[PDB]
Write a protein that binds this ligand. Structure first.
Ligand SMILES: [Zn+2]
Ligand SMILES: [Zn+2]
Ligand SMILES: [Zn+2]
Ligand SMILES: [Zn+2]
Ligand SMILES: [Zn+2]
Ligand SMILES: [Zn+2]
Ligand SMILES: [Zn+2]
Ligand SMILES: [Zn+2]
Lengths: 343, 343, 343, 343
């Protein structure tokens, strides 16, 4: 089969041919129909600091994908051959304290498909049977392929007190932030403010947000004061940019909540007293997807039509042309790019 | 000044002339621009048991109204003359276990506007300044007049775990239940099911629900099963109808939540163990509006446009044609009737 | 081995000799060191209505027990041979909506050890590997044997808003109610009131409760008003007695919580409006133990010494003398009776 | 009347004579029976930056006091002459986003007793009637005097998911952290770990903690590991010490909660991604006392006897010997110092 791999400790990826993996007990073989690309994949590709401390070549990458269950291992009762599925990238241990608590999304021994073991940028991939989420047969694979990143948005948005009937500020219009914009709008947030310095990304958030802000042309804190009268009740942070983080926290009203998915590249200077403790703020560290309630909430929204992810699918390319694909992503000229492993 | 009052211990109300009242300390004088009527007012109309043991004539009725701050009492600094406001009907004592605990919606010393003291079915009314909710000048008074009953819906929907990304069954398509349908739809619930025997009421929910059900014509359970695959996660009960209550609980998946606003006219037969305990169901008794939180969530929905309450106002009549307003009520025909105290 | 069984659709149980069960994939063989008896077992014994609709002879009963892992099935990584364990009686399916939600305690396909399949009133018993909770080797088996019923108390007490710094009323001094009395006292509840008509049971609650009440000699509602000044914030109901339920709910303050574990023998007449909806009460149906957080909280309390269950172990008898054992229980002359299968 | 005041922009305080103030509308006149001092008072004492940008002489300091209602203002009906009361130092505006939302503890217009206006370091003080908490006549005034700072602890412990049945690490054994230790012990936490370099402070917690740790002498992490098997579920931070903050977060299991009352004197270096985001940690900024809830939980603990605050009062000095009280403070020696304004 065809597969995109990182064969050595350097830049780029390579198209190779590998035998079809085989599912043993508790596993299933999945025929990949669509897969997507995100920041993690871009770290691997550029072979930067992050990638260097986490990746161990050889590795077939790809952690955002959907396909059909082509085979199951001995004893696997579910899913079943023929089922259409989306995949949870985190493989949890079930033998640590986080798992005991039900906090699977932060399992101490978390292993990630396409990062720690072979992923979905291939025609076939073997994953744990418990990691498969069966979708309605009419759900387009393309959309099914991006439920994983969508989950991140969902998790962030519904963490804490949620967003229904509350003012919200989203800092970062990257793909997950655009997705969170769709979710807060379909959840009854209002007013909704989305802030991002890149025009191309902001635009994508226009049909959902009530006010778009380019922190580099308007004083975010002041637009917020004029839109709400003071501050927002909720801050959803997806960029990791330190100045946005500080601005965003200053934007919260006392007693508010900041939910943080964004990963800053370096430690930040933080005024614990001023930005959190003294104003009674609660900061939520968001990681992964809550195992099963995040998937339940998110697929509920998509299956029923409360949200429509389609406009986020800016490009479709055969896996063969992966280079053009990463290029588009890397340049900010795309939101969700789909790769087809059959071509 | 024209006012509509219950002058003696009997059915009906009487159109009267009273001098314009004056606000003392801590009070304001509202020039009412719009009022609405609901079941409570009906109880007072027909002078039934309830009214009998509660109303003390002479009394200007009405608790659902909006208007303008004509003048304030000495030392009152909020709201201000010229402010457009809606009224919270519950006047809380601030001196009971319920208020201390922050459960003002259930103050044991609750004094209701229009039942225990003069209400808004008049050109002017004096009320506690703390009961006034200031609205943007551009919100129609007609809509502002129904924010109180809308709050009841809001309170029921956001109670417990909310409804975002969840399957919801709403029993009762009367005015409040209908507002609930608008809210759960704008809050991202899905699938959304609404059940009520009256096809008139049920049709108002078509643009908000995913599935409409007349339980007298279809098996509600079998329909819930076909739409969700089993049960709903949330039950929102507005009818107080015993059969609907029993059926709704059965449609709830184990571990789900039932939030009850509906008041049955008589005790029900309840299999505590089978309908609640053994299935791990939690039942929420909803009453009033959480003081200020319910108003914040609801008005945010309205102000931002997440929900549009216009479709619920079927009739606007002059206060002097009240005989007909109370008839529409007792009959069913309308959803929410507005009364114009200036005519 | 020795085992206590229900061999036919009638009263009583029978001592028999059966081969030692064998653990297959995903299972473990447990050598039982101690087991206890409760109401469920008494239903089976008396072969009453309940038992008749649930039991299917032949059945080795016993669902409250602890022992040592004597053997594990092929592939079972944990627990391990030699481990000391307590057992969760509920065997969950992992393929229903409750399980999906994490509400394992109300799994639609729940199977119960000692009720639906052979239990612990035997020298040996095979249970699912995932149902074993490993205890510190120095925890006395006797105490380990009663962690299952303890969990019920724990679940009830920590459901909702918990009990820390709140007035609590416990109706029912049966064994789980006494256990809940120990837990609310070790949790910072205050004042704590325990009410039960049986003197022998009340007494057991004296070192934990702040006020003991015999509803049949004092007006429960009035003692409560004098102890708190109005009502309690939390009601923990363990009896299922209808008058206690009504009394208890009347005892709650508006906005309070009632957590119900008690199973009434017959439907009750319930004034939905008066007892729940109008006073903003929230009723929690408690079933089983939350899979893992209930066990985490409860074993934490026991391992650290925050609670000491020992005084509840009123009797110890070899399994051979099971009849005297059930007799004591049936007569209200005991709290937790331990049966030893080795004799 | 004797009072202790900051009369000019400099260090120190001055013992003075003022006429007994009179309560206007909505106010009461408290005859102070006991007052206490904390770090804030110290800031005012040494007149540092903080005090500099906040205090406006002439000002009678003190915010931790208890006393008797000597007389009430016209029309004040609660509390009453003769009532023993404690004072909430925060005077809230009831006109900001924070108050509307019910987050009075963080009112943007908070006016503090003894910092923005006359306090209790005097024989008499006039305060808003709504700030008085009525105590049972038999509670010692000395203990009643420290309910305010105790509330800070209470608020920190019960924030988030509470602590019952959970493993807890408390960093900082100063007065508040020590009160926190008493509360978490009385609330059923276990194992309970308390870390602080000062062996004087640490010894006060011996009767409440399960494990005492001097982090300068032992590796806090390795100790937490040996006591829990991994990490603690809850982190309660009271020191504001950057090193303790970083170490405590590391000791928290993934998905745990950190509740921070501690105010660092300077911004910290914070690895947002590593210490919060990637581990799914939630950090709670705790400030003040939740208005009325914190007081209800705390006083219930005290009134019922779940906690005994007596051990925390090391010294009781006449107000006139304040020079020494402020010395004990700045030095460490004592826990809580009481000042008797009648001498
Ligand atoms: Zn991704
Ligand atoms: Zn794990
Ligand atoms: Zn109404
Ligand atoms: Zn009240
Ligand atoms: Zn049992
Ligand atoms: Zn199940
Ligand atoms: Zn202080
Ligand atoms: Zn305020």
């Amino acid at each position: 089969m065809r597969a995109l791999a990182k064969l050595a400790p350097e830049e780029g990826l390579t198209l190779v041919d590998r035998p079809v993996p085989e599912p043993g007990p508790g596993e299933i073989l999945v025929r990949v129909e669509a897969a997507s690309i995100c920041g993690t994949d871009l770290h691997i590709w550029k072979w930067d600091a992050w990638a260097r401390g986490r990746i161990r070549p050889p590795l077939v990458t790809g952690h955002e994908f959907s396909g059909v269950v082509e085979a199951v291992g001995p004893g696997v009762r579910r899913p079943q051959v023929g089922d259409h599925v989306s995949l949870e990238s985190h493989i949890v241990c079930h033998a640590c304290p986080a798992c005991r608590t039900g906090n699977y999304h932060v399992c101490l021994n978390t292993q990630i498909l396409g990062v720690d073991r072979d992923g979905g940028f291939a025609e076939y991939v073997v994953v744990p049977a418990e990691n498969a989420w069966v979708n309605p047969k009419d759900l387009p694979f393309e959309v099914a392929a991006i439920l994983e990143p969508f989950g991140n948005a969902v998790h962030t948005v519904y963490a804490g007190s949620g967003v229904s009937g509350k003012s919200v500020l989203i800092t970062g219009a990257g793909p997950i932030g655009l997705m969170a914009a769709m979710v807060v709008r379909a959840s009854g947030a209002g007013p909704i403010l989305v802030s991002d310095p890149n025009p191309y990304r902001l635009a994508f958030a226009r049909p959902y947000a009530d006010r778009l802000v380019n922190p580099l042309e308007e004083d975010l804190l002041e637009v917020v004061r004029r839109v709400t009268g003071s501050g927002v009740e909720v801050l959803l942070e997806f960029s990791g940019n330190e100045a946005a983080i500080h601005q965003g926290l200053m934007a919260l009203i006392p007693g508010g909540e900041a939910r943080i998915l964004g990963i800053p590249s370096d430690p930040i200077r933080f005024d614990l007293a001023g930005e959190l403790v003294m104003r009674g703020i609660t900061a939520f560290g968001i990681a992964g997807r809550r195992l099963w309630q995040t998937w339940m909430q998110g697929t509920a929204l998509v299956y029923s039509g409360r949200v429509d992810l389609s406009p986020l699918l800016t490009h479709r390319l055969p896996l063969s042309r992966y280079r053009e694909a990463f290029g588009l992503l890397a340049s900010g000229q795309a939101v969700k790019v789909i790769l087809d492993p059959k071509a």
